[PDB]
Amino acid sequence: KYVDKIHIGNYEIDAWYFSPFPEDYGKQPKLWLCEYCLKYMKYEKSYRFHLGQCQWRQPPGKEIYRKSNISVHEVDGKDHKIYCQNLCLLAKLFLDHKTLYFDVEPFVFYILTEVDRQGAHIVGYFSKEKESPDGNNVSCIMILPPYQRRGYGRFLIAFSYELSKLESTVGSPEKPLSDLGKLSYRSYWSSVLLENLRDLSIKDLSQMTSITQNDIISTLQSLNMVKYWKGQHVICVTPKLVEEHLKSAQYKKPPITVDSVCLKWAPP
Numbered sequence: 001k002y003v004d005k006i007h008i009g010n011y012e013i014d015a016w017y018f019s020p021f022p023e024d025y026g027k028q029p030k031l032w033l034c035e036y037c038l039k040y041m042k043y044e045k046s047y048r049f050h051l052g053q054c055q056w057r058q059p060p061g062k063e064i065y066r067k068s069n070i071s072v073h074e075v076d077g078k079d080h081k082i083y084c085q086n087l088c089l090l091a092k093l094f095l096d097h098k099t100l101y102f103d104v105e106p107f108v109f110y111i112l113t114e115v116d117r118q119g120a121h122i123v124g125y126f127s128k129e130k131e132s133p134d135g136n137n138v139s140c141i142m143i144l145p146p147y148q149r150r151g152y153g154r155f156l157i158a159f160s161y162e163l164s165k166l167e168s169t170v171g172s173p174e175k176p177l178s179d180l181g182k183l184s185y186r187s188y189w190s191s192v193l194l195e196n197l198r199d200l201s202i203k204d205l206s207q208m209t210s211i212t213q214n215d216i217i218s219t220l221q222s223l224n225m226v227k228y229w230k231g232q233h234v235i236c237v238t239p240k241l242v243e244e245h246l247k248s249a250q251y252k253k254p255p256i257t258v259d260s261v262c263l264k265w266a267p268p
């Protein structure tokens with residue numbers, strides 16, 4: 001019997017996938033998690049006692065982004081191993097393809113929180129390899145179900161590229177993406193490339209956005225905005241076509257933006 005439901009913060013969330021919590025935790029009807037330190041617990045009564053004792057009110061590590069009540073904390077897997085392991089176990093409940101939960105030292109984790117008077121409330125996160133041979137600027141990216149489709153995943157995607165820009169490098173999320181992750185990346189890539197084309201080669205779009213040329217190309221292909229000439233993909237779009245796409249329906253929700261002025265981060 002697996003964990004099939006969690007209590008975290010004020011949320012109850014059904015699981016989507018197996019996550020390898022220890023077997024005596026899986027047998028319970030519900031797993032209870034501290035939303036701040038991510039300790040997982042077996043019983044409502046151990047949970048209630050923890051909440052009265054636990055002094056964390058935000059993620060560990062350093063706050064590398066803060067604008068109003070939106071916060072990102074950078075957590076080195078080697079300096080906060082238990083926390084990062086608990087995060088990985090939580091994420092695996094909602095990610096089919098994640099496979100790494102306990103060997104977190106090679107990773108840095110970026111925790112998105114929404115802040116009120118009580119504390120910084122976890123919304124989702126992405127992990128990133130400290131050293132990525134493959135040029136992945138995201139390893140796993142997860143938004144908790146009650147926050148999905150509300151602009152938070154777009155924020156974290158945009159955030160992963162802002163770090164890539166600061167590293168003077170392109171990057172791409174590690175494959176395979178979850179289904180919602182796929183739709184989300186395609187929509188983010190469209191928005192960013194279309195906005196840059198409104199206001200340029202494929203290589204220019206790549207250097208301006210840190211989106212890889214392959215991701216740019218496959219995005220422009222889905223928009224039917226690339227020609228092929230003698231073995232080369234070549235952008236082929238009119239300003240009017242760009243605006244037709246941009247004011248269409250799916251680009252209408254106002255984003256949580258990443259304000260680079262509020263990003264406190266130096267490339268390793």
Ligand SMILES: Cc1cc(OC(C)C)cc(C(=O)NNS(=O)(=O)c2ccccc2)c1F
Nearest residue numbers: 142143148149150151152153154178184187
């Ligand atoms: C990357 C990602 C992962 C995710 O978790 C899954 C893995 C369980 C959820 C989201 C998410 O919530 N997307 N919706 S969105 O933020 O409103 C958004 C609107 C427009 C363009 C991009 C995103 C997400 F982006």
Ligand code: NA
Nearest residue numbers: 012013014145
């Ligand atoms: Na649910």
Ligand SMILES: [Zn+2]
Nearest residue numbers: 034037039054
């Ligand atoms: Zn706690």
